[PDB]
């Protein structure tokens, strides 16, 4: 009842999820000239040394690399955040062509893909309770451009053949998400939402300014995944991004001058 086709894509979602037309929807265009430096921000702290990856799942819209979120093993703190946010999964959004695929844009520029590291606020006990809160989630967003390979991405790419179709999963232990981060942690932040149904307005977005580079071959492997289940007609998993939504009564803050 939802996806990324013409018949069931972003422009239809509001019929089932009227929050699609809400006051704090994501993604947005980041107007770099209008974002303002915020001195009240604290330094970002990414603490991923004890991360425990478990599994990779094709859920029919993306693939998720899932983590053990039953302890504070991989946590995000600081920046705009109050308290501790635990990493639950990461996934990507990507295009059919290198010129589109990101959900956020920067001065209207689209990247080839966007990495989302999803974290939930431990004051709410579990993810399902967190998504019902305005400060429930913190998503670290990282743009991908095509250029050199990203070495720390290769282990992800090479398991994708084993999860081609919706509902397939594979063991995915001992993956280090630190190998997906750029050098700088400079960022933009704003209050927003999930970008997939149910579109809940529960996310503090933290979007890094510095993209990571991946190779042609790496992105091409994303594009070989399928939205469909095994034994259904093949539909390539591409263009699984929601376009930019109205900023409305929000200000985007920058961590840097
Ligand atoms: Ni459906
Ligand atoms: Ni996402």
Swiss-Prot record:
Active-site residues annotated for this sequence: 61
Outcome following mutation: residue 59 to A: Reduced activity
CDD domains referenced in this protein's UniProt entry, alphabetically: alpha_CA_I_II_III_XIII (cd03119)
Its EC number(s): 4.2.1.1, 4.2.1.69
Modes of activity regulation: Activated by X-ray, histamine, L-adrenaline, L- and D-phenylalanine, L- and D-histidine, L-His-OMe and beta-Ala-His (carnosine).
Claim: Magnesium is one of the keywords in the record: no
Residues at the site labelled Fine-tunes the proton-transfer properties of H-64: 4, 59, 64
UniProt KW Endoplasmic reticulum keyword: no
Binding positions for Zn(2+) per the UniProt entry: 91, 93, 116
Effect recorded for residue 59 to H: Reduced proton transfer
Recorded consequence of changing residue 103 to A/Q: Strongly reduced CO(2) hydrase activity
Phenotypic consequence of residue 59 to V: Reduced activity
Known catalytic reactions: hydrogencarbonate + H(+) = CO2 + H2O; urea = cyanamide + H2O
Listed GO MF terms: arylesterase activity; carbonate dehydratase activity; cyanamide hydratase activity; zinc ion binding
Annotated phenotype, changing residue 194 to E/H/R: Strongly reduced CO(2) hydrase activity
pH dependence, entry free text: Optimum pH is 6-8.
UniProt enzyme class: lyase
Keywords assigned by UniProt, alphabetized: Acetylation, Cell membrane, Cytoplasm, Disease variant, Lyase, Membrane, Metal-binding, Osteopetrosis, Phosphoprotein, Zinc
GO annotation terms (biological process): angiotensin-activated signaling pathway; carbon dioxide transport; morphogenesis of an epithelium; neuron cellular homeostasis; positive regulation of cellular pH reduction; positive regulation of dipeptide transmembrane transport; positive regulation of synaptic transmission, GABAergic; regulation of chloride transport
Functional note: Catalyzes the reversible hydration of carbon dioxide. Can also hydrate cyanamide to urea. Stimulates the chloride-bicarbonate exchange activity of SLC26A6. Essential for bone resorption and osteoclast differentiation. Involved in the regulation of fluid secretion into the anterior chamber of the eye. Contributes to intracellular pH regulation in the duodenal upper villous epithelium during proton-coupled peptide absorption.
Record's subunit section: Interacts with SLC4A4. Interaction with SLC4A7 regulates SLC4A7 transporter activity. Interacts with SLC26A6 isoform 4 (via C-terminus cytoplasmic domain).
Disorder association: Osteopetrosis, autosomal recessive 3: A rare genetic disease characterized by abnormally dense bone, due to defective resorption of immature bone. Osteopetrosis occurs in two forms: a severe autosomal recessive form occurring in utero, infancy, or childhood, and a benign autosomal dominant form occurring in adolescence or adulthood. Recessive osteopetrosis commonly manifests in early infancy with macrocephaly, feeding difficulties, evolving blindness and deafness, bone marrow failure, severe anemia, and hepatosplenomegaly.
Protein name in the entry: Carbonic anhydrase 2
The organism of origin for this protein: Homo sapiens
């Amino acid at each position: 009842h939802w996806g990324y086709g013409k018949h069931n894509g972003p422009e239809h979602w509001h019929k089932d999820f009227p929050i699609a037309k809400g006051e704090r929807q994501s993604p947005v265009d980041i107007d770099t000239h209008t974002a303002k430096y915020d001195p009240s921000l604290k330094p970002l702290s990414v603490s991923y040394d004890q991360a425990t990856s478990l599994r990779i799942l094709n859920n029919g819209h993306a693939f998720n690399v899932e983590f053990d979120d039953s302890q504070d093993k991989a946590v995000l703190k600081g920046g705009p955040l109050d308290g501790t946010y635990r990493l639950i999964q990461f996934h990507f959004h990507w295009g059919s062509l290198d010129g589109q695929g990101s959900e956020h844009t920067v001065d209207k520029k689209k990247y080839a893909a966007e990495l989302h590291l999803v974290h939930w606020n431990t004051k709410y006990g579990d993810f399902g309770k967190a998504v019902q809160q305005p400060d429930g989630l913190a998503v670290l967003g990282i743009f991908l451009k095509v250029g050199s390979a990203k070495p720390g991405l290769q282990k992800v790419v090479d398991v994708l053949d084993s999860i081609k179709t919706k509902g397939k999963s594979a063991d995915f232990t001992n993956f280090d998400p630190r190998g997906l981060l750029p050098e700088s942690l400079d960022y933009w932040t704003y209050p927003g939402s999930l970008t997939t149904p149910p579109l809940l307005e529960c996310v503090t977005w933290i979007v890094l300014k510095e993209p990571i580079s991946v190779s042609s071959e790496q992105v091409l492997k994303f594009r070989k995944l399928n939205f469909n289940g095994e034994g259904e007609p093949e539909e390539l998993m591409v263009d699984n991004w929601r376009p930019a939504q109205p900023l409305k009564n929000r200000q985007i803050k920058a961590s840097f001058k």
